[PDB]
Design a protein around this ligand. Structure first.
Ligand SMILES: *[C@@H]1O[C@H](CO)[C@@H](O)[C@H](O)[C@H]1NC(C)=O
Ligand SMILES: NCc1ccccc1
Ligand SMILES: NCc1ccccc1
Ligand code: NA
Ligand code: NA
Lengths: 10, 250, 30
């Protein structure tokens, strides 16, 4: 249930 | 955090969330001690009884946060890990003695109104403040009860407990590298860390210089907020020579 | 850091948080 984080950090 | 309250904005700007990449989830708390170094509990990274042995690429740290689950655009900063360092005498077999680890970030984090490091104690501040009855503050995004989860960072203030009382509350062997905190059954008030809060900071505000110091790391407890049990915290000052050795050499 | 432990939104503006007084009141010595 966490909001997606920017792809740049993954 | 059990029986705490919502943090104020900017109340704990050294708070760090240890975040698993896949599945995306909260792993632990942690704290910011400089622009490149984050302090946490060793058991957040290495606990073989639970098949836990994270590598740097498994994890992110999220700094400046308030909301547990939101991506706090323009406020939080997300950092990758360059290297994990676990205390070489961390005792995961028996009792989590020396439950401490450091994480070096790949790039320095920019400080802001929401992101700012906590101080580490020196001998004099530990001697002055680490006394039974003196209260510290614990913060985290962990569970609200032993057996749900908060919208925002939670905060609770808890008194340090006399060492014989800590020892007499448990069958586990308690070492000089641990202290315990929490209210006694007859004291009325309540509160504790819980699952998801471990690795986060136990802080005290020095009345001598008005600065916040991290005296403990949330380490372990038998349940959460149980009558006659206490939370156990890594004694940061007792392990400070190892902290300094790591930072000075890496 | 020379600036460690001084929060931008509290100590650096001389603003007190809602429960830090509880900590101070527990610090009986000195
Ligand atoms: C943890 O994992 C690292 C890398 O996979 C390995 O070198 C180390 O021996 C492991 N430690 C334990 C206690 O399993
Ligand atoms: N080996 C039992 C144990 C685990 C964690 C913390 C204390 C004790
Ligand atoms: N069993 C959760 C926990 C961890 C640390 C301190 C108190 C409670
Ligand atoms: Na005992
Ligand atoms: Na208790």
């Amino acid at each position: 249930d966490f909001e997606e984080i920017p792809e740049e950090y993954l | 955090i059990v029986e705490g309250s919502d943090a104020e904005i900017g109340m704990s700007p050294w708070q760090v969330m240890l975040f698993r990449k896949s599945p995306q989830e909260l792993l632990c708390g942690a704290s910011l001690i400089s622009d490149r170094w984050v302090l946490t509990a060793a058991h957040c990274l290495l606990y073989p009884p639970w098949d836990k042995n994270f590598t740097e690429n498994d994890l992110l740290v999220r700094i400046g946060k308030h909301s547990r689950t939101r991506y706090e655009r323009n406020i939080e900063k997300i950092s990758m890990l360059e290297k994990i360092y676990i205390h070489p005498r961390y005792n995961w077999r028996e009792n989590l003695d020396r439950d401490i680890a450091l994480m070096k970030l790949k790039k320095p984090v920019a400080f802001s109104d929401y992101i700012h490091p906590v101080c580490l104690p020196d001998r004099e501040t530990a001697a002055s403040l680490l006394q039974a009855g003196y209260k510290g503050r614990v913060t985290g995004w962990g569970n609200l009860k032993e057996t749900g989860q908060p919208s925002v960072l939670q905060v609770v203030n808890l008194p340090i407990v006399e060492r014989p009382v800590c020892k007499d509350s448990t069958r586990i062997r308690i070492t000089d590298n641990m202290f315990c905190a929490g209210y006694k059954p007859d004291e009325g008030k309540r509160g504790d860390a819980c699952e998801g809060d471990s690795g986060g900071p136990f802080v005290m505000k020095s009345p001598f210089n008005n600065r916040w110091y991290q005296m403990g790391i949330v380490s372990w407890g038998e349940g959460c907020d149980r009558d006659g049990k206490y939370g156990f915290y890594t004694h940061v000052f007792r392990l400070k020579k190892w902290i300094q050795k790591v930072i000075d050499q890496f | 850091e020379a600036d460690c432990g001084l929060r931008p939104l509290f100590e650096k503006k001389s603003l007190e948080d809602k429960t830090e007084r509880e900590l101070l009141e527990s610090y009986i010595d000195g």
